[PDB]
């Protein structure tokens, strides 16, 4: 039950027959029954800041006048 994921490669070695190019993956196998024991996946999501930046009831259209 191995989990193979891809890495986001920053510095590339002069290789495209092993390293650098052909997508570098990494393996993860969980060893414990409790989820709390797992390492962090870091494969996280982002969201639109709107809930904090534009909490207004009537939608904001940037090109138009704020107050109308």
């Amino acid at each position: 039950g191995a989990q193979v994921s891809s890495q986001k490669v920053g510095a590339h070695e002069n290789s495209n027959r092993a390293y650098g190019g052909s997508t570098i993956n990494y393996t993860t196998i969980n060893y414990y029954r409790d989820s709390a024991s797992n390492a962090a996946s870091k494969q996280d999501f982002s969201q639109d800041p709107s809930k904090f930046t534009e909490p207004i009831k009537d939608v904001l259209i940037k090109t138009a006048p704020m107050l109308n």
Binding site: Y32, R33, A36, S37, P49, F52, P65
Partner: protein
Amino acid sequence: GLPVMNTPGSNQYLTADNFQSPCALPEFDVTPPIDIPGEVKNMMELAEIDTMIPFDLSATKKNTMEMYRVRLSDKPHTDDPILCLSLSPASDPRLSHTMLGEILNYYTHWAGSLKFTFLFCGSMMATGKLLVSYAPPGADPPKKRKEAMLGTHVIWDIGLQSSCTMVVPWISNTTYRQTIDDSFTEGGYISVFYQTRIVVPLSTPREMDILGFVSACNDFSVRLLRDTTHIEQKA
């Protein structure tokens, strides 16, 4: 047993590691989460929120409500600045303590465009035109409208729409700048001047305040987590 060989780094404790470890409370019945309003997914979301700048850090105004108020008046037109500030969001005293600044203090490098928004707080009867400017670094810091006028700028006309935003575009040599005062990665200068002047009719307050706000744009990012100097525990 399986023949194995220990490599360097064995037995070390790197505080930044990400390993599995045995659970001290197996089979614990964890309480499920509820949909609490306001979940944050990334710190930059907080940086995108406008926060007020404490522009006037004079000896008497610092650490008081006054630090936030930039005072304008209906005096005759002048080419002298209303305020001057350095584009050092994490190190200039005026920017360092804003939400943006504070978040920046936990990182070593920053990048992206910023935006300053000014709110005029005078009477409805007061009118005026101001010039907000950003001059990339490398030349004499603008001290006259004449110079400021040459860099990136927005001429703000005071009216029904009470606020104005100037975007400071990401213009830099390096791909990221230092989060400290550094010449090599210096950011430039922000300044505000009177385009015309503030004009009021009779029976109106002749002096009033403007408030400034700073926030990051959608293209802003930070990197290299580090500890902040903004907090300490003596002994």
